[PDB]
Design a protein around this ligand. Structure first.
Ligand SMILES: [K+]
Ligand SMILES: [K+]
Ligand SMILES: [K+]
Ligand SMILES: [K+]
Ligand SMILES: [K+]
Ligand SMILES: [Mg+2]
Ligand SMILES: [Mg+2]
Ligand SMILES: [Mg+2]
Ligand SMILES: [Mg+2]
Ligand SMILES: [Mg+2]
Ligand SMILES: [Mg+2]
Ligand SMILES: [Mg+2]
Ligand SMILES: [Mg+2]
Ligand SMILES: [Mg+2]
Ligand SMILES: [Mg+2]
Ligand SMILES: [Mg+2]
Ligand SMILES: [Mg+2]
Ligand SMILES: [Mg+2]
Ligand SMILES: [Mg+2]
Ligand SMILES: [Mg+2]
Ligand SMILES: [Mg+2]
Ligand SMILES: [Mg+2]
Ligand SMILES: [Mg+2]
Ligand SMILES: [Mg+2]
Ligand SMILES: [Mg+2]
Ligand SMILES: [Mg+2]
Ligand SMILES: [Mg+2]
Ligand SMILES: [Mg+2]
Ligand SMILES: [Mg+2]
Ligand SMILES: [Mg+2]
Ligand SMILES: [Mg+2]
Ligand SMILES: [Mg+2]
Ligand SMILES: [Mg+2]
Ligand SMILES: [Mg+2]
Ligand SMILES: [Mg+2]
Ligand SMILES: [Mg+2]
Ligand SMILES: [Mg+2]
Ligand SMILES: [Mg+2]
Ligand SMILES: [Mg+2]
Ligand SMILES: [Mg+2]
Ligand SMILES: [Mg+2]
Ligand SMILES: [Mg+2]
Ligand SMILES: [Mg+2]
Ligand SMILES: [Mg+2]
Ligand SMILES: [Mg+2]
Ligand SMILES: [Mg+2]
Ligand SMILES: [Mg+2]
Ligand SMILES: [Mg+2]
Ligand SMILES: [Mg+2]
Ligand SMILES: [Mg+2]
Ligand SMILES: [Mg+2]
Ligand SMILES: [Mg+2]
Ligand SMILES: [Mg+2]
Ligand SMILES: [Mg+2]
Ligand SMILES: [Mg+2]
Ligand SMILES: [Mg+2]
Ligand SMILES: [Mg+2]
Ligand SMILES: [Mg+2]
Ligand SMILES: [Zn+2]
Lengths: 110, 150, 147, 43, 307, 153
RNA sequence: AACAAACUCCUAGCCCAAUACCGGACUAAUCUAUUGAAACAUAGAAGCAAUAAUGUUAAUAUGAGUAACAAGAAGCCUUUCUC
RNA sequence: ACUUCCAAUCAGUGAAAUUAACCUUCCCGUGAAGAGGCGGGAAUAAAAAAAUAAGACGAGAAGACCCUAUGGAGCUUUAAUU
RNA sequence: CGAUGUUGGAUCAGGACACCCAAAUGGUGCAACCGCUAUUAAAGGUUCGUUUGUUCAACGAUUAAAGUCCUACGUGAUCUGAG
RNA sequence: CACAAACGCGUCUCAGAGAUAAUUAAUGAUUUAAUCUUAACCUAAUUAACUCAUAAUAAAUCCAGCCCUAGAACAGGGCACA
């Protein structure tokens, strides 16, 4: 079908500015206690997660160099140790990942 | 049309004509030329009628400023502050006299639509109609179906 | 409705004008006892359509008055007022009551009562004995006839 | 519901518009005037 | 002031979330168990049965369906309706609701306080009951009025009675004209092009419009419906379960409004029934575990012999 | 009418749905923390819960071995499942994995992301939403009720 | 009776409708001859005036942010898997 | 009944026929003879999204049918001239 | 005639009563049964098949009955194209 | 019927009062008979519509998130013991 007449701008403005078609505001925005940036209540902080993801990639990159083959996987548990630390008695019998940087604050040793 | 332009009520400035009549025209300024053929009507008016016009109307001040111009103009100012521009470009002598005489008789208010052809203050002599001006009063002011107190 | 239409519009005020909001409330009581002239109780019909197919309803004047007591008077006025958009506004000022049961709020607002447009004739039992003796006996019936 | 066939003022079938009491008086008033008209022309 | 949205669990600490749940839970049991004496807490006067009187219905939960057999060998299907928490909420005078019959308000099963409106929670606080899920209005004559806060049980209906059922049916969403109204479709293979389930012509040429009553595709299912003339076969006492013949509208685990049948044949069939309702305290006797209709084959009855 | 349907239509059909979750589950076992679309991660949670249940059965049970053969498409992860993941989970019954909503991906599609991981993984902890401390004003007021309640009852 | 016209009186006038064809008086904007010199006058000349040709060119809208278009997954980021 | 491509919501890019102006209702009557616009009556807070195609004598092609034009052309011959 | 798309079916039917059935009743060359005829009533209903492109008609089986007609002889921006 | 559902071929339910047209009968006058009466009063037998009894709907102002036998979007029902 084809339109019969040109829509006037008075009609178009009513349709294009109806409250349904407008952008709704968000009232669930909060400041992250740790870093002070912005995040939603039900969503993890973007800055804090990006902080973790960068560190996780570095740890995984070190693991790749410790298993050259593409089908080599450990048969035991894994523990990550940073500079200035030594494996504990309970941590023995597990593969050791060494990182040169100082242990990050958020990461907690057990 | 009437819906397009503004409107005003019939009003006389400063309650003119009540105690005494004051000619509301204040001054005129003629801007004519001494060489332009289109200013011939203005020049003939100045030589003949301007001197006699000033005598009849001592309440107006007439300024004549012959300067190089192409369209002769006459500017009339009134007491209330309204200035009205006019063009006397290429008009006969008697047409200028009629045009100037008309400017002398105008009150100076804006020439727009007048809503009513009359104006009055306190028109309600001997009272104005209200829905109680012709209804008889009932004994005791009783409503149509009101029960008496006793 | 003829006098009620005038009061609602304001055609009784010498200050009348359609643009102005001049208008007077009218309270009509005892609307169950209206008296249609002639056989209009059975001949006049009020018809309306609900919109849906097969929804054309025609109701006799007697049937409508038996269901909605004030419908006869309200429709009569609703058709006599001017057909502009003010008719809806000025119908809200019309108050109809089937009998003499008026809220005290409405009663305190009244001013005057309009006269009845039709003089109600009185029945035979309402004539006083003085009137009966005053009216002459037109004829003399025979004494031997049995009524 | 009931229609006048064709145009309502021309043809075989027309509108049944009757003569009114006002129209009868207008004819009589003109007739009385013309009755006086033909008397002043008589002599 | 653009105040942020909040919920009950937002600011509660991990050591207090279990505590608050215990706090509200203990309140519900105390409130529910304090209403179990309708005849010991100064109830409204009880009047004897009169012709043309109407009783008070219940709000029950639809469990499922079971087969049931009668003594003549026929098979019937019964729907298990369970009454979980039924209390009369408020009483409306005759002249303030309809002008002919009084209105009694009955609530549904218990729900959580944390997800109801402020006014709804405040209303129940004054009465002293936990919030209800569904609330319905019952038309009751003045001679069968019940004091608000009086509990109701499945024994309110005695087996042998015919009852109605009102509940929202199963919503099937935006369904086409063939499913919604049952129009026949166009043929499938004899050349038909892009037309197999469409309504087809919807009006006539002359009218140049579509009548308001025309059937068109739209919403189907999620509306209120009522089933009439459902006979009550078996009543269970301890679990408060009502067995109704046939199929009742509504999906499983929905709330169903039950009332006495209004059919002309089933009029005045309440003289031999509790009035205005079954009060367990007044009888001072234990009802049977299950109440059976006279035509029902009980599970502990000898097998049918047509001798 | 999708009443009672607990599964989701993903990929090119019912067969592609399994294979999409087969690759995701393989990545989850090897890396112990992966991120994908929220809808696909939600489906993957159900299988990751029950895969550990098959792992607890043992290395000798044939059904567990065949079930782990199909889902672990990389053949060097079967020994890991029966000797690392299964021994680690012996206490809890269903608390095997965590799901949290990662913010939307910084790309055109703007999909809703989620992060799925196994308990006790050898990775930095996620920024979990921490509840209010008991020293807060609202918590302190409520603790007053509990101390008084426990004193009498 | 009353209310009711382009009719007819009343008060001022510049003192009586129209399609094809025909008659007349003025006139917007250009150039030239003399004037004019904060933009005109008397004349002589013309590419001398666009609410209408499914008109031409260019720019804008409406239909419409509608129809329709695309990148297999995870990760250690380019290596393993699913087809 | 169930799947895939469409579909509806979100993010990116974003076209076409069409359009005198529209603040774009129903009924009966009228009328260049089938009215959203006239007359007599009815109905009537304003907008958005998704659907069905009765009407807008819907959109598309200066009707292929039919006739007219001292308008063309192809074919045939016992038309005229050659 | 700078276009009002043309038979029959399919889907959906809106309406009229000059009624085929269902309900009430008068008359009879109406004993009953089966009929003929007239008045009143339009809320609901009015079948499935062989041949023909067929509407129509013939024939088989059945039904309380298989009504007459208008609606662009309804309905192709919903379908069919046998004619 | 290879989903926890949908579906028919399967199962369930389906109503009282008023009111009428033709017609039939009682009482009775113009016409002291008779006569159902566009004569009055009262009253009787009586089509279908139609109207209504009755039934359904019912709480203004928690709502970020998750679930749902609620759903295109938007809405709606749950999230205390589960
Ligand atoms: K005619
Ligand atoms: K249409
Ligand atoms: K034509
Ligand atoms: K019919
Ligand atoms: K007689
Ligand atoms: Mg006509
Ligand atoms: Mg005539
Ligand atoms: Mg649904
Ligand atoms: Mg079919
Ligand atoms: Mg095709
Ligand atoms: Mg097809
Ligand atoms: Mg129409
Ligand atoms: Mg819908
Ligand atoms: Mg689902
Ligand atoms: Mg897809
Ligand atoms: Mg889920
Ligand atoms: Mg006049
Ligand atoms: Mg003329
Ligand atoms: Mg002509
Ligand atoms: Mg010139
Ligand atoms: Mg030109
Ligand atoms: Mg132009
Ligand atoms: Mg065109
Ligand atoms: Mg043009
Ligand atoms: Mg340009
Ligand atoms: Mg646009
Ligand atoms: Mg569109
Ligand atoms: Mg699309
Ligand atoms: Mg988009
Ligand atoms: Mg409008
Ligand atoms: Mg018409
Ligand atoms: Mg009108
Ligand atoms: Mg009109
Ligand atoms: Mg759309
Ligand atoms: Mg649409
Ligand atoms: Mg038009
Ligand atoms: Mg058409
Ligand atoms: Mg067209
Ligand atoms: Mg042509
Ligand atoms: Mg031809
Ligand atoms: Mg010719
Ligand atoms: Mg020729
Ligand atoms: Mg030629
Ligand atoms: Mg040639
Ligand atoms: Mg020859
Ligand atoms: Mg056209
Ligand atoms: Mg047909
Ligand atoms: Mg029909
Ligand atoms: Mg008839
Ligand atoms: Mg019959
Ligand atoms: Mg046709
Ligand atoms: Mg056709
Ligand atoms: Mg087509
Ligand atoms: Mg069509
Ligand atoms: Mg053919
Ligand atoms: Mg007699
Ligand atoms: Mg009702
Ligand atoms: Mg809710
Ligand atoms: Zn942060």
């Amino acid at each position: 079908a084809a339109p019969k007449n040109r829509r006037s701008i008075e009609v178009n403005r009513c349709r294009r500015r109806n409250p349904q078609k407008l952008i709704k505001v968000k009232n669930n925005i909060d400041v992250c206690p740790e870093c002070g940036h912005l995040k939603q209540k039900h969503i993890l902080c973007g800055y804090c997660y990006e902080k973790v993801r960068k560190e996780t990639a570095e740890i995984r990159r070190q693991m790749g160099k410790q298993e050259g083959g593409p089908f080599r996987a450990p048969t035991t548990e894994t523990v990550v140790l940073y500079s200035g630390e030594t494996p504990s008695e309970q941590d023995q019998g597990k593969r050791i990942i060494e990182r040169e940087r100082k242990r990050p604050s958020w990461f907690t040793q057990n | 049309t009437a819906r397009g332009t503004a409107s005003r009520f019939l009003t006389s400035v400063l309650h003119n004509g009540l105690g005494r009549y004051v000619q509301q025209l204040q001054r005129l300024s003629f801007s004519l030329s001494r060489d332009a053929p289109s200013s011939r009507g203005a020049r003939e008016f100045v030589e003949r009628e301007v001197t006699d016009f000033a005598r009849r109307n001592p309440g107006v001040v007439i300024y004549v400023n012959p300067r190089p111009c192409c369209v002769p103009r006459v500017v009339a100012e009134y007491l209330n502050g309204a200035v009205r521009e006019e063009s006397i470009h290429c008009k006969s002598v008697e047409e200028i006299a009629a045009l100037v005489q008309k400017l002398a008789d105008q009150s100076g208010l804006d020439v727009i639509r007048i809503r009513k052809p009359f104006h009055t203050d306190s028109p309600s002599i001997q009272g104005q109609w209200h829905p109680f001006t012709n209804k008889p009063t009932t004994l005791g002011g009783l409503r149509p179906r009101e029960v008496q107190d006793p | 409705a003829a006098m009620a239409s005038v009061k609602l519009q304001g055609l009784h005020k010498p200050v009348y004008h359609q643009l102005s909001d001049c208008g007077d409330h009218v309270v009509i009581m005892n609307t169950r006892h209206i008296a249609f002239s002639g056989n209009k109780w059975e001949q006049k019909v009020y018809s309306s359509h609900t919109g849906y197919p097969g929804g054309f309803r025609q109701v006799t004047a007697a049937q409508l008055h038996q269901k909605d007591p004030v419908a006869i008077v309200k429709l009569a006025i609703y058709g006599m007022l001017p057909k502009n958009l003010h008719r809806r506004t000025m119908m809200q000022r019309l108050h109809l009551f089937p009998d003499e049961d008026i809220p005290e709020d409405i009663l305190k607002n009244l001013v005057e009562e309009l006269p009845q447009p039709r003089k109600v004739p009185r029945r035979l039992d309402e004539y006083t004995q003085e009137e009966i003796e005053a009216f002459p006996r037109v004829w003399s019936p025979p004494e031997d006839y049995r009524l | 519901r009931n229609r006048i066939p064709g145009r309502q003022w021309i043809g075989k079938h027309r509108r049944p518009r009757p003569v009114s009491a006002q129209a009868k008086q207008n004819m009589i008033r003109r007739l009385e005037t013309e009755a006086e008209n033909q008397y002043w022309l008589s002599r | 002031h653009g105040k942020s949205v909040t919920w009950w669990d937002e600011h509660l600490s991990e050591e207090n979330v279990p505590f608050v749940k215990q706090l509200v839970s203990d309140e519900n049991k105390a409130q529910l168990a304090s209403k179990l004496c309708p005849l010991k807490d100064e109830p409204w006067p009880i009047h004897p049965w009169e012709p043309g009187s109407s009783r008070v219905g219940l709000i029950a939960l639809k469990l499922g369906m079971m087969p049931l057999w009668t003594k003549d060998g026929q098979k019937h299907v019964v729907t298990l309706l369970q009454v979980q928490d039924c209390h009369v909420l408020k009483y409306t005078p005759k002249e303030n609701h309809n002008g002919r019959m009084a209105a009694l308000t009955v609530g549904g099963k218990t729900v959580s306080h944390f997800h109801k409106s402020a006014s709804i929670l405040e209303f129940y606080q004054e009465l002293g009951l936990p919030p209800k899920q569904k609330v319905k209005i019952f038309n009751v004559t003045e001679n069968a009025v019940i004091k608000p806060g009086t509990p109701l049980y499945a024994a309110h209906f005695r087996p042998g009675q015919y009852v109605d059922v009102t509940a929202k049916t199963i919503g099937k969403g935006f369904q086409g004209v063939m499913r919604r109204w049952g129009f026949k479709g166009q043929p499938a293979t004899h050349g038909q092009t892009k037309t197999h389930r469409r309504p087809g012509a919807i009006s006539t040429g002359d009218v140049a419009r579509v009548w308001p009553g025309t059937k068109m595709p739209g919403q189907l299912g999620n509306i209120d419906r009522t089933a009439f003339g459902l006979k009550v076969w078996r009543i269970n006492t301890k679990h408060n379960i009502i067995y109704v013949n046939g199929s009742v509208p509504g999906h499983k685990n929905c709330l169903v409004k039950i009332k006495d049948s209004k059919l002309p044949a089933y009029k005045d069939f309440c003289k031999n029934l509790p009035f205005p309702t079954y009060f367990p305290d007044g009888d001072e006797e234990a009802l049977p575990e299950d109440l059976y209709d006279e035509n029902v084959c009980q599970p502990g009855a000898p097998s049918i012999t047509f001798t | 009418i999708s009443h009672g349907r607990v599964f989701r239509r993903l990929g090119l059909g019912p067969e592609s749905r399994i294979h999409l979750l087969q690759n995701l589950l393989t990545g989850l076992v090897r890396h112990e923390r992966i991120e994908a679309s929220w809808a696909r991660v939600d489906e993957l949670r159900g299988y990751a819960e029950k895969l550990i249940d098959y792992g607890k059965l043992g290395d000798t049970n044939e059904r567990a071995m065949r079930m782990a053969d199909f889902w672990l498409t990389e053949k060097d992860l079967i020994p890991k499942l029966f000797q690392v993941l299964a021994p680690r989970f012996q206490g809890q019954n269903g608390g095997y994995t965590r799901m949290l909503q990662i913010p939307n991906r910084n790309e055109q599609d703007r999909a809703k992301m989620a992060v799925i991981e196994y308990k006790g993984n050898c990775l930095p902890p996620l920024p979990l939403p921490r509840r209010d401390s008991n020293l807060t004003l609202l918590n302190q007021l409520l603790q007053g009720l509990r101390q008084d309640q426990e004193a009498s009852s």
